[PDB]
Amino acid sequence: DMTQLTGSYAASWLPWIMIPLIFYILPFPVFALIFIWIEKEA
Amino acid sequence: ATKFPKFSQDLAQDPTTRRIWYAMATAHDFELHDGMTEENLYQKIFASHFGHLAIIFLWASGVLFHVAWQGNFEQWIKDPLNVRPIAHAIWDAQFGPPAIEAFTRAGATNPVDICYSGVYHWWYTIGMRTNNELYVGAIFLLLLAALFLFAGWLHLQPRYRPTLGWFKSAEPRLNHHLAGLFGVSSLAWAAHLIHVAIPESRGQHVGWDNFLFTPPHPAGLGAFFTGNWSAYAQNPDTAQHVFNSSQGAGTAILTFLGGFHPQTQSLWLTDMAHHHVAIAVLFIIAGHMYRTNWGIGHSIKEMLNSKSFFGAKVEGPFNLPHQGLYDTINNSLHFQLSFALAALGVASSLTAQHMYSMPPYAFIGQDFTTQAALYTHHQYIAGFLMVGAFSHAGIFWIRDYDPEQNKGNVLDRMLRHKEAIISHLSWVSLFLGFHTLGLYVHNDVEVAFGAAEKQVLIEPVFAQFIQAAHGKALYGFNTLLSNPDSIASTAWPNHANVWLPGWLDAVNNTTNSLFLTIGPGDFYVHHAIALGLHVTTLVLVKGALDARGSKLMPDKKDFGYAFPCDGPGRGGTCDISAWDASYLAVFWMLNTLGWVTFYWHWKHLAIWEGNIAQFNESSTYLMGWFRDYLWLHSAQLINGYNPYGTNSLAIWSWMFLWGHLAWAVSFMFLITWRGYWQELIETLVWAHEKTPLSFGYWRDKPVALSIVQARLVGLTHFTVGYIATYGAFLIASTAGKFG
Amino acid sequence: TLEGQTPIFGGGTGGLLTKAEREEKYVITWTSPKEQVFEMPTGGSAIMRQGKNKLEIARKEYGIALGGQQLRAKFKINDYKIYRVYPNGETQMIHPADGVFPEKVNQGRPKVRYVDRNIGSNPSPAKLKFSGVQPYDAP
Amino acid sequence: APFPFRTIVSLILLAGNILVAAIYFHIIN
Amino acid sequence: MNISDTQVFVALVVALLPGLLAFRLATELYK
Amino acid sequence: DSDGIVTHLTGGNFATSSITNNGWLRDFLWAQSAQVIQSYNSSLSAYGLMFLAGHFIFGFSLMFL
Amino acid sequence: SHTVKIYDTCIGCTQCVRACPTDVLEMVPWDGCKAAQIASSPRTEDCVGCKRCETACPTDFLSIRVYLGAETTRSMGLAY
Amino acid sequence: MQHVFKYLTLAPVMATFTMVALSVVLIMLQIWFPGLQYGTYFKPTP
Amino acid sequence: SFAMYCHNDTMRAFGRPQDMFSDTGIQLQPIFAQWIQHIHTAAVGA
Amino acid sequence: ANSTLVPCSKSPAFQARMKNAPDTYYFNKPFKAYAKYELCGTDGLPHLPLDRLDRATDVLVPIGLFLYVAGFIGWSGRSYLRATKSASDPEMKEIFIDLPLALQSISKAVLWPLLALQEFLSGDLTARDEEIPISPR
Ligand code: F6C
Numbered sequence A: 001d002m003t004q005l006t007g008s009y010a011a012s013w014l015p016w017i018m019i020p021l022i023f024y025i026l027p028f029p030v031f032a033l034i035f036i037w038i039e040k041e042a
Numbered sequence B: 001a002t003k004f005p006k007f008s009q010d011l012a013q014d015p016t017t018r019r020i021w022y023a024m025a026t027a028h029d030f031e032l033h034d035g036m037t038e039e040n041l042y043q044k045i046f047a048s049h050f051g052h053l054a055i056i057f058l059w060a061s062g063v064l065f066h067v068a069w070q071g072n073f074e075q076w077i078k079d080p081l082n083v084r085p086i087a088h089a090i091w092d093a094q095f096g097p098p099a100i101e102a103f104t105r106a107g108a109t110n111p112v113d114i115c116y117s118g119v120y121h122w123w124y125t126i127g128m129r130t131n132n133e134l135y136v137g138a139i140f141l142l143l144l145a146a147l148f149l150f151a152g153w154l155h156l157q158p159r160y161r162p163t164l165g166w167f168k169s170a171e172p173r174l175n176h177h178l179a180g181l182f183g184v185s186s187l188a189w190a191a192h193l194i195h196v197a198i199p200e201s202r203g204q205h206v207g208w209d210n211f212l213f214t215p216p217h218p219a220g221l222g223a224f225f226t227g228n229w230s231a232y233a234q235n236p237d238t239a240q241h242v243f244n245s246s247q248g249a250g251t252a253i254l255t256f257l258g259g260f261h262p263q264t265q266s267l268w269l270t271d272m273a274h275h276h277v278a279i280a281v282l283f284i285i286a287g288h289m290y291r292t293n294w295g296i297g298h299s300i301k302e303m304l305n306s307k308s309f310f311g312a313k314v315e316g317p318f319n320l321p322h323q324g325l326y327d328t329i330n331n332s333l334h335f336q337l338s339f340a341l342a343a344l345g346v347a348s349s350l351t352a353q354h355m356y357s358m359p360p361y362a363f364i365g366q367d368f369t370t371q372a373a374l375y376t377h378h379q380y381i382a383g384f385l386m387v388g389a390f391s392h393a394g395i396f397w398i399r400d401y402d403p404e405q406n407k408g409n410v411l412d413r414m415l416r417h418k419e420a421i422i423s424h425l426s427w428v429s430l431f432l433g434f435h436t437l438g439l440y441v442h443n444d445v446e447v448a449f450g451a452a453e454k455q456v457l458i459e460p461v462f463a464q465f466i467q468a469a470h471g472k473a474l475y476g477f478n479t480l481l482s483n484p485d486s487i488a489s490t491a492w493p494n495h496a497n498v499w500l501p502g503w504l505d506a507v508n509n510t511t512n513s514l515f516l517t518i519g520p521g522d523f524y525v526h527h528a529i530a531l532g533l534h535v536t537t538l539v540l541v542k543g544a545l546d547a548r549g550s551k552l553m554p555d556k557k558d559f560g561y562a563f564p565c566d567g568p569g570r571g572g573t574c575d576i577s578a579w580d581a582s583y584l585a586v587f588w589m590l591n592t593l594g595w596v597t598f599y600w601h602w603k604h605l606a607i608w609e610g611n612i613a614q615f616n617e618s619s620t621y622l623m624g625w626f627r628d629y630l631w632l633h634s635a636q637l638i639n640g641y642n643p644y645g646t647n648s649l650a651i652w653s654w655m656f657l658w659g660h661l662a663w664a665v666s667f668m669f670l671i672t673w674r675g676y677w678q679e680l681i682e683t684l685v686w687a688h689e690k691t692p693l694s695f696g697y698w699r700d701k702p703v704a705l706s707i708v709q710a711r712l713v714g715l716t717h718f719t720v721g722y723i724a725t726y727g728a729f730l731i732a733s734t735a736g737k738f739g
Numbered sequence C: 001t002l003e004g005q006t007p008i009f010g011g012g013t014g015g016l017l018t019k020a021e022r023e024e025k026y027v028i029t030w031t032s033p034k035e036q037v038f039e040m041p042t043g044g045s046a047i048m049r050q051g052k053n054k055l056e057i058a059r060k061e062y063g064i065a066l067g068g069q070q071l072r073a074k075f076k077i078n079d080y081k082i083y084r085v086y087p088n089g090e091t092q093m094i095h096p097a098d099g100v101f102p103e104k105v106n107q108g109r110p111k112v113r114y115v116d117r118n119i120g121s122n123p124s125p126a127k128l129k130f131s132g133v134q135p136y137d138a139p
Numbered sequence D: 001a002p003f004p005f006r007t008i009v010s011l012i013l014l015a016g017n018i019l020v021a022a023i024y025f026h027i028i029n
Numbered sequence E: 001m002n003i004s005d006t007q008v009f010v011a012l013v014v015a016l017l018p019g020l021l022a023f024r025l026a027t028e029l030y031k
Numbered sequence F: 001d002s003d004g005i006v007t008h009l010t011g012g013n014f015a016t017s018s019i020t021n022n023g024w025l026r027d028f029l030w031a032q033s034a035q036v037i038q039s040y041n042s043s044l045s046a047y048g049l050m051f052l053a054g055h056f057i058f059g060f061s062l063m064f065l
Numbered sequence G: 001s002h003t004v005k006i007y008d009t010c011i012g013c014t015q016c017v018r019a020c021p022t023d024v025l026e027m028v029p030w031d032g033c034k035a036a037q038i039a040s041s042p043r044t045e046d047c048v049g050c051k052r053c054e055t056a057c058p059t060d061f062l063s064i065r066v067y068l069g070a071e072t073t074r075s076m077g078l079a080y
Numbered sequence H: 001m002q003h004v005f006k007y008l009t010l011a012p013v014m015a016t017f018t019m020v021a022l023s024v025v026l027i028m029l030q031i032w033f034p035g036l037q038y039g040t041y042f043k044p045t046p
Numbered sequence I: 001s002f003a004m005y006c007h008n009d010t011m012r013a014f015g016r017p018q019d020m021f022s023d024t025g026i027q028l029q030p031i032f033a034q035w036i037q038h039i040h041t042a043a044v045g046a
Numbered sequence J: 001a002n003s004t005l006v007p008c009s010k011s012p013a014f015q016a017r018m019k020n021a022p023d024t025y026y027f028n029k030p031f032k033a034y035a036k037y038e039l040c041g042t043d044g045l046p047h048l049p050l051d052r053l054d055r056a057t058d059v060l061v062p063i064g065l066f067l068y069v070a071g072f073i074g075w076s077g078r079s080y081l082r083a084t085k086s087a088s089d090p091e092m093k094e095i096f097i098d099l100p101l102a103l104q105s106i107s108k109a110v111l112w113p114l115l116a117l118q119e120f121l122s123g124d125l126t127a128r129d130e131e132i133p134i135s136p137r
C-alpha cells in the first residue's frame, strides 16, 4: 500500500530508526559535544 | 582564553563570537598556524590528502551500496532505454499519501529517487551485471578507504614522517606520477576492459572466479610477443551486434573502428580499450624523461636556467628568461596548486564538452536528463576550479613571490606590464559587451516591432568551416574531411584512415550531438560566452597582479590576501583586497556558466522535443530566451504541487523555491553592511540584560559578522541558491518532458 | 576614590552594562565655570554642575569625544581627566597620560613603534616565511 | 629596433592564419 | 534481486573499520 | 451575463492559490505575465520591451551594491 | 590589539594625534623633520582601528599605518 | 550676454547639443531610408 | 506571517492540504475585519 | 561553397514573410531590397555570411565607414586634450569647451589616418614607459 512509508529492500526497518537517529535524536547531543569543545577554557 | 582554536592564540583570546567563525575559516590555512614550520606544513598536508582520498572512496562505496541495496540495477539492464534508474530509497516520515504515491515509481513498491548521475550506464558498460558485484565493489572500497586512512595516520608517526627534502624532490615525483599513476593505471584499466568489460558485452561472464583461465582473445598472449598485433584487431563487433549478448559479437579486443556502436549509440568498447593501451604507452614513456638516481634524464632546474642554444647565446627557451623559476614553483605550494586547479578546470570542461557529443557509455546518450545533469555538473565544477587557480595565483604573489630571486625572469616581466595586460583585457570585455548586447537588443526591437527580417544575423561561418573540415557535409563546403577527394580524407601516402568511415557516419548522423548544426543564434551566444570568459579573467587577473599593491594601496602585500579595506581615506577602499577580486569573480563565473548551461540546455531541449526551429528563430533575441526557454519550460516545474494535487516533481518545485529563497537571503548579506547590524545587536544586548527570567548569558560576546565574513556568507548563499534553482529547473524541465 | 558630583540626568538606556561591573569602567572628571547643558556621549542631554563634575562612561572613546569635542571645543574646559576603574577598585589616570595633551609635544616622551625607513621599504612577506615576523616589524 | 625574433614568430603565426583562410576561401585544396 | 539482510549487516560491521581509522587519523591530525 | 452570474478575470484563484508562494509564483507571476511576455509583434510590444528593460536595470544595479 | 607604526616620512603635523578618538597617539620630540616632532603610538591597546589617523596624514605615502590584528573587547568598540 | 555665451559652452550643454544633433541626423536617416541593412547600404532601390 | 506561507508550501507539496492554513484546513478568519464590514453595511440599513 | 544560404528572392520562407508583411513605409521598400541583395537561411530571414569572396564591398564599406568615424572622434578628442595641456588651467577647458580650439581639432581630424601615421613614424604618438605614472610592483 501507498499510505505509509515502506521498504521492499532488505532490512527495511533500518531507515525507520536511522532517519530519526541521525536527524533529530543524535544531532542535539552532537551539538552539545561541539559546544563544550569550543567553549573549553585554556 | 579558550583551547579552541588550537592553532591560533589571537583567535583563542578573542572574547566575541568572531572567534568561532574565524576558527572554521582559517582551520585549513596551515601556513598561518602558530609555530608552523615548513616541514610540519608538508607533513600535515600529506596526511590531510590521505583523508580526502578516503572520503572519495567512501563516497563511491556509498553510491554502489545504495544502488545494490535499494536500486533496480538488474531490472534496468534488461531494458536501459525504458527503465528509470533508482538512486536510493526515500524515508521522509512527514510525507502524505499523495507524496508517497507520487514518488513510488520506476517499478519500485516504495518511494525512490531517480538516479541522474549516469552511474547505471557507467557500471553497465564496464561489465557489471549483478547487485552482488556492486556489493562486492562497495565492500572493497570500504577496505580501500580504511587502507588510506591508516596510511595517513602511519605517515604522521615519527619514524614514517617524510623529510622536507622528500617533498621537494620534483623529478622523481613527476616520473612516478607520469609512468605509474597515469601510465600504469591506464594500462591496468585497459586490462580490465579487455579481460572483463569486452567479454561481458558479448554475453560471456568473466569474474574473479574464472578470469585466470579464460583468455580474452583466442590468439592468446603469443600474438603480442611474436609481433602479430593485427590478430587482436581481426573480426570486430558487427554492425548488428546486440550489447550484453553474443548475437553479432566479434572476437577482436583492440579495434579502431571509430564512431559509435550502432545499438548503444556510444563509443566502441574495443576502441576505448586500444585508447587506454596507447595512452599507457605514451605516459610510461613520458615518465622516463627526468633524472632521478641514474644520471640519465633531464634536470628541470638546468632546463629553466639554460642560456645557450647549441652554442648561440639566448635568454632562455623561446629566447625568454626562465631562470630561477625552478625554486619559485618548488618552494610555492600556491603556485603548484594554481596549475593543479587550472589543469583540473580545463579537464573538467573537456569532460563536459566531449561526453555529450561522444557518449562513452551504452545508452547514456538517450537519457536526456542524465546528459543535461552531467554537462552542467562538470561545467560548473570547471568554473569553480578556474576561479581557484587564479585565487591561489594571487596568494602566491603576496606570500611566496619575492622579487630578488625572480629578478629579470619571465614571471617578473609579467608584473612589469600589468597595466597593459589589464587595460587590454578591459578593452576586449568592453568591445564584446557593447556589441553583443547591442546586437541582441537591436534584434529585440525589430522582432517586437514585427520586423524579424530586419534582425542582424551574423552566420558563424568560421565554426561552420571547422565542422565541414571535420566531415560535416550539411553546409555544402567541400574541404578536408567533407571532401572525399581531399588529401586529408584519403591520407594519400598510407591510406591508414581506418578511423574515417566510422567517424563520418557519426558526424553526419542526424540523431546525435556530434557537431550540432549551428546558425546565427549560436553565433551570438558564443560571443556572449567570450564576453563572460574575458571579464571573469579580467577580474581574476587584475586581482592577482594588483595583489601586491597598487596606486591606491602601494603596501597591499603587508596586509595579506584577505582584509576588509583600508578605511574611508584616500576616497574609500572598499573591496580592495585580492580576496575581494576572487569574491567578485565568482559572480561573473556563475553568470558565464549560466549563459553556457542555458545555451546547452535550450539547444538540446529543442532537439529532444522535435522543435529545433524554435531555438533557431528565437535564440537571436533575448526575449526569445526569456519567453521560449525560461517561461515556456517552467510550466511543468511549477506545477509539481498545486491546489489540485502533487506529482513526482514536487521535490523540484520545493527546491526551486528553496533556491530562490537562498538567493534572496544573499542579497541581505551583500547589500546591507556590518555597522548597521552591530548597532542593532547592541540594542538587543541591552534588552537581554534588562529582561528578568532570562538566566542565560553569552560566553562569547555577540557581534555582527565581519566585513570579509559577510562577503563570503553572502557569496555562499548566492551560489547555493544559484545552483539549487537551476538544478531543480534543469531536472524538472527535462525529466518531466522525457524519461 | 574619585571626587566630583554627577551631572543632573534623569536616566537613560545608553549607560553602563555588565561590562562595567565585570571587566572595566571609565570615569571622566572636569570643572566648569557655570551650570550648563551638554550632550551625553550615548544620547540625551545632561546638566553639568557648578563645581567639579564626575561622569561614569562605558568606553574610553566616550570620554575622549566628550572632553575633546564638547568640553574643550564648546565649553572651553581644559582640565578634564579620564580614569580607568577596575572592578577590584584600582583606578589609574590615563588621559592626559603625562599631564600634557598628546597633540602638544612634550619632553621626556619616548618614540614608540617607530620604523626607521619609509613605508615603501618594507620587506616582502616571502623573505620572512615561517619566521613569525611581519614586514612592518622587520628590522 | 626591427625585433627579429618577435617578427619571425609573428609572421609564421600569421602565415598559418593565411594558409587556413586559403582553404577556407576555396583558394587551395 | 537486491542484497539480503546479512549483506547489509556485514557492510555495517565492515564500515566500522574505516570509521575507527577515521577517528584515529582525525585525532592524529589534531595533534 | 444576462443572468447576473459573474465570471472573474482569474476565476477566484486568490482563496486557494495565494496561501502559498508557489501559488504566487505560478498563478500570479507566471500566469499573469502571459500578456507582457507574448506582446511582441503587437501594439503592446513596448510593454514587452520595458519588461526586459526593467529586468536589465535591476541586474545592472547589483554590481554597484 | 592593533599595531600602529610611524615611519620616518613623518612631518610632525600632529594631525593624526588630533584625529584619534581613543588617544592612542602622542607627539614626541624628534630631529628628522622641520617640525622637530614625530608621532608615537604608546597606547595601541586602546586602538579601535578606525584609521582616522591615516585619513588625516598628509604625507604620500602615509607616515602612519594601522595593521588590524587580534581583536579584544576595547578594540572591537564594545560597551558590553 | 557674454556670461550666457560662456554658459552655452559648458560640457553638459555642449554634450546635449551634440547628442541632439546626432539623434536628429540618425532619425532623419531612418525616415528617408528605412530598413537599411548590412549588404544594402549605398545600393539603388530595386 | 511568512514562515506560515512556507508551512503551507511544505504541506501542499507533502499532499497534506488538511494541515495547511486555509479556509478548508486550519482556518485563520479575520473576524475583526469581517465584523467592521458587517457594521458598516448595517449602518446604512443594508 | 555554402549551400544552406540562398538568395532571399528564391527562398520560399522569405517570400511568405514578404506577402504577410504589413503595407507600410517600413516594409514595402526594405523587403524589395532584401530580396535582391540579401542571402536568406531556411527560416526565411536574411543572414550575413563572411565566407564569400564576392560581396566583399558589402563587408568593407560599413567596416571602413565606422572605423573612419570612430577614429575621427578619437583623434579630435586626443588633439584637443593635448592642446589644453599647455594651458594654466586645463581642467577648466574640459568643463568649458574652448570652441576655437575644438574647431581646429575637428578640422585636422578629417585626415586622421594620415596624421596618426606620421605621429607613429615620428615617435610622437606614444609616451615613453618610464615617463608614465605606475604603481609599485
Ligand atoms: C541562552 C539563553 C537565552 C535566553 C534566556 O536565557 C534568551 C532570552 C531572550 C529574551 C530576553 C528576549 C525575548 C525572547 C524572544 O521572544 O525572542 C527570543 C526567542 C528565542 C526562542 C530565544 C531562545 C531562548 C533560549 C535560547 C532557549 C534555549 C533552549 C533550547 C531548546 C536549547 C537547545 C540546546 C540543544 C543542544 C540544541 C530575547 C530576544 C532575542 N534573542 Mg535571546 N535568549 C537566549 C539566547 C539567544 C541566542 C543564542 C541568540 C542568537 C540566535 C538570541 C537572539 C535573540 C534575538 C535576535 C532576540 C530578540 O529580538 C528578543 C528580544 O530581546 O526582544 C526584546 N538569543 N531573548
Ligand code: CLA
Pocket (backbone or CB within 6 Å): A014, A015, A016, A018, A019, A022, B055, B058, B059, B060, B061, B062, B063, B065, B066, B088, B089, B090, B091, E011, E012, E013, E015
Ligand atoms: C558517503 C557515503 C554515503 C552516503 C552519502 C549515504 C547516504 C545515505 N544513506 Mg547510507 N550507507 C553507506 C554510505 C553512504 N550513504 C554505506 C557505506 C553503508 C553501509 C555501512 C550505508 C548504510 C546505510 C543504511 C543502513 C541506511 C543508509 C541511509 C542513507 C540515507 C540517509 C542517511 C542515513 O541514515 O545514513 C545512515 C548511514 C549509515 C548507517 C552508515 C554510513 C557510513 C558511511 C560510509 C559514512 C560516510 C561518512 C562521510 C564519508 C564523512 C563525511 C565528512 C563530512 C566533512 C561531509 C542517505 C541517502 C538510510 C536510508 O536508506 O534511508 C532511506 C539507512 O537506513 N545508509
Ligand code: CLA
Pocket (backbone or CB within 6 Å): A019, A023, B089, B090, B091, B092, B093, B099, B103, B113, B650, B651, B654, B723, I009, I010, I011, I013, I014
Ligand atoms: C519541513 C521540510 C522538510 C524537511 C525537514 C525534510 C527532511 C528530509 N527529507 Mg524531505 N521533502 C520535503 C520537505 C522536508 N523534508 C518536501 C516538501 C518534499 C517534496 C514533496 C520532500 C521530498 C523529499 C525527497 C524526495 C527526499 C527527502 C529526503 C529527506 C531526508 C533527508 C534530509 C534532507 O532533506 O536533506 C538534508 C541535507 C543534509 C543534512 C546535508 C548533508 C550534509 C552534506 C555533507 C552536505 C554536502 C553539500 C554538498 C556536497 C554540496 C551540494 C552537492 C549537490 C550539488 C549535489 C530528511 C528526512 C530524502 C530522504 O528520504 O533521504 C533519506 C529524499 O530522498 N525529502
Ligand code: CLA
Pocket (backbone or CB within 6 Å): B024, B025, B026, B027, B028, B029, B030, B337, B341, B384, B385, B386, B387, B388, B389, B391, B392, B395, B561, B562, B579, B582, B712, B716, B720
Ligand atoms: C584542491 C583544491 C584546493 C585546495 C587544497 C585549497 C586550499 C586552500 N585554499 Mg582554496 N580554493 C579552491 C580550491 C582549493 N583551495 C577553489 C576551487 C577556490 C575557488 C572557489 C578557492 C578559493 C579560495 C579563497 C578565496 C581562499 C582560499 C584559501 C585557501 C587556503 C586556506 C583554506 C581556508 O580558508 O580554510 C578552510 C576554509 C573553509 C573550510 C571554507 C568554508 C567552506 C566554504 C565557505 C564553502 C561553503 C560550504 C558549502 C555550503 C558546502 C560545502 C561542502 C561542505 C562539506 C563543507 C588553503 C591553502 C584562503 C587562503 O589561502 O587565504 C589566504 C582564501 O582566502 N581558497
Ligand code: CLA
Pocket (backbone or CB within 6 Å): B426, B429, B430, B431, B432, B433, B434, B437, B535, B538, B539, B584, B585, B587, B588, F056, F058, F059, F060, F061, F062, F063, F064
Ligand atoms: C545585468 C547586470 C550587469 C551588467 C550589464 C554589467 C555590465 C558590466 N560589468 Mg558588471 N557586475 C554585475 C552585473 C552586471 N555588470 C554584478 C552583479 C557584479 C558582481 C558585483 C559585477 C561585477 C563586475 C566586475 C568585477 C567587473 C564588471 C565589469 C563590467 C563591464 C564589462 C562588460 C562590458 O564592458 O560590456 C559593455 C558595457 C555594458 C554592456 C554596460 C551597459 C552599457 C549601456 C547599455 C549603454 C547605454 C547607454 C545609454 C545612452 C544610457 C542611457 C542614459 C542613462 C545614463 C540615463 C560592464 C559595464 C568589468 C569592467 O568594468 O570591465 C571594463 C569588471 O571589472 N562587473
Ligand code: CLA
Pocket (backbone or CB within 6 Å): B427, B430, B431, B432, B434, B435, J062, J063, J066, J067, J069, J070, J071, J073, J074, J075
Ligand atoms: C550601428 C553601428 C555601431 C555602433 C553604434 C557601434 C558602437 C561602438 N563601437 Mg563599434 N563597430 C561597428 C558598428 C558599430 N559600433 C562595426 C560594423 C565594426 C566593424 C566590425 C565596429 C568595430 C569596432 C571596434 C574595433 C571598436 C568599436 C567600439 C565601439 C564603441 C565606441 C565607438 C567609438 O567611436 O568610441 C569613440 C572613439 C574613441 C574613444 C576612440 C576611437 C576608438 C576606435 C574604435 C579605435 C581606433 C580606430 C583605428 C582604426 C584603430 C582600430 C583598432 C582595431 C584594428 C583593433 C561603441 C559602443 C570600440 C569599443 O568597443 O571600445 C571598447 C572599439 O574599439 N567598434
Ligand code: CLA
Pocket (backbone or CB within 6 Å): B423, B424, B426, B427, B430, J073, J074, J075, J076, J077, J078, J080, J097, J102, J105, J106
Ligand atoms: C577623448 C576621446 C577618447 C579617446 C581617444 C580614448 C581612447 C581610448 N580609450 Mg577611452 N574613454 C574616453 C575617451 C577617450 N578614450 C572617455 C570620455 C571615457 C569615459 C566614459 C573613456 C573610458 C574608457 C575605458 C573604460 C576604457 C577606455 C579605453 C581606451 C583605449 C582603447 C579603447 C577605446 O578606443 O575606447 C573606446 C571608448 C570608450 C570605452 C568610451 C569613450 C567614448 C566617449 C563617450 C567619447 C568622448 C568623445 C569626446 C567627448 C570628444 C570631445 C572632443 C572635442 C572637445 C573636440 C584607447 C586608448 C580602454 C583601454 O584602456 O584599452 C586599452 C578601456 O578599458 N576608455
Ligand SMILES: CC1=C(/C=C/C(C)=C/C=C/C(C)=C\C=C\C=C(C)\C=C\C=C(C)\C=C\C2=C(C)CCCC2(C)C)C(C)(C)CCC1
Pocket (backbone or CB within 6 Å): J050, J059, J070, J071, J072, J073, J074, J075, J078, J112, J116
Ligand atoms: C579581415 C576582417 C576581419 C578580421 C580582422 C582581424 C583579425 C584584424 C586584426 C587586427 C589586429 C590584430 C589589430 C591590432 C592592433 C594593435 C594595436 C597596438 C593598435 C593600436 C591602435 C592605436 C594606438 C590607435 C590610436 C588612435 C587612433 C589612430 C585614432 C583614434 C584615437 C586613437 C588614439 C585611439 C573580420 C572577420 C573581423 C571582419 C571582416 C574583415
Ligand code: SF4
Pocket (backbone or CB within 6 Å): G006, G009, G010, G011, G012, G013, G014, G015, G016, G017, G038, G039, G053, G056, G057, G058, G059, G063, G064
Ligand atoms: S598625520 Fe602623518 S605626518 Fe602628521 S604627525 Fe601624524 S604621522 Fe606625522
